[PDB]
Amino acid sequence: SSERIRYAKWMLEHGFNIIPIDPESKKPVLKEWQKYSHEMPSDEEKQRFLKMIEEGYNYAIPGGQKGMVIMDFESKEKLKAWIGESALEELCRKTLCTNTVHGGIHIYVLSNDIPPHKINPLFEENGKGIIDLQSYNSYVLGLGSCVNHLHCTTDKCPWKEQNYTTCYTLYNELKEISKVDLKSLLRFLAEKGKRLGITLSKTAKEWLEG
């Protein structure tokens, strides 16, 4: 059928919880969706959630689940120039990467080490963050979800007020979310970025440096 339901079913298939997004509020159908970073949904909530998504609701994936966290980069092209095409391909070869509706890229990973606390932005370029880590108490829109930008009027908006719809798509190939040595990955981003003026944030270094 649609890619939206295929991928929603795919995340479930792999033991990850998803939550439908209300088309109007643009927020999860349930106020306390955070509980899904730690438990499933009953078989009479899952069914309900899948019908809504089939009907056309977008859906989100709570972070933190089974050590799963999403590295949320504001710009794919920026990341390509930062760590290089080879490194980006390598990463999106071992784990799941998706294109966001605003031109960014989500790299999903499994990490024993999850910042016990919220630490963002991880990296900054011009006193402005360029990547956030989505873990417990946050979520990302999943593959197949689409957003019409007609109602976006701020600056975080590339498609400000445009009658234009984009969707979360695969960077390249579908891959199971896999393990990565997170601190090592962040060390890598740091070494690649200092020559480009891309640096670790304050809290970020603190955590990293232990």
What DSSP letter does each residue of 146-189 carry, written as one string? EEEGGG--SSS-TTTT-S-EEE-EESSS----EE--HHHHHHHH
Please tell me whether 106 is known to bind a ligand.
no
The answer to whether 96 contacts Zn ion (rule: CB under 5 A) is no
Buried-exposed string 86-116: b where 16+ CB fall within 10 A, e elsewhere: eebeebbeebbbbbbbeebbbbbbbbeebbe
> Could you give the CA distance from residue 149 to residue 167 in angstroms, rounded to a whole number?
11
- In angstroms, give the least distance from the CB of 40 to Mn ion: 25
Residue 141 as a binder of Zn ion (CB under 5 A): the answer is no
Would you state the torsion angle of the CA atoms of residues 206, 138, 86, 195, taken in this order, to the nearest 10 degrees? Answer: -30
Closest approach of Mn ion to the CB of residue 169, in Å: 15
Per CB under 5 A, the segment of 17-25, 119-127, 170-178, 190-198 that binds Zn ion is 170-178
Of 72 and 125, CB closest to Mn ion: 72
The rounded distance, in Å, linking the Cα atoms of 24 and 8 is 20
Write the interaction track for Mn ion spanning residues 58-77; mark x where CB under 5 A is met and - where it is not. --------------x-----
Please report, as residue ranges, which positions from 3 to 62 form the binding site for Zn ion (by CB under 5 A). Answer: none
Structure tokens at 109: 């990973």
Judged by beta carbon, residue 72 or residue 124, the one nearer Mn ion is 72
Binding mask 144-183 for Mn ion (x = CB under 5 A): ----------------------------------------
Q: Reduce the DSSP state of residue 132 to 3 states and report it.
A: strand
Binding site for Zn ion (CB under 5 A): 149, 152, 159, 176
- Binding positions for Mn ion, rule: CB under 5 A: 72
Binding residues for Mn(2+): 72
Sequence ranges of the binding site: 14, 72, 102, 149, 152, 157, 176
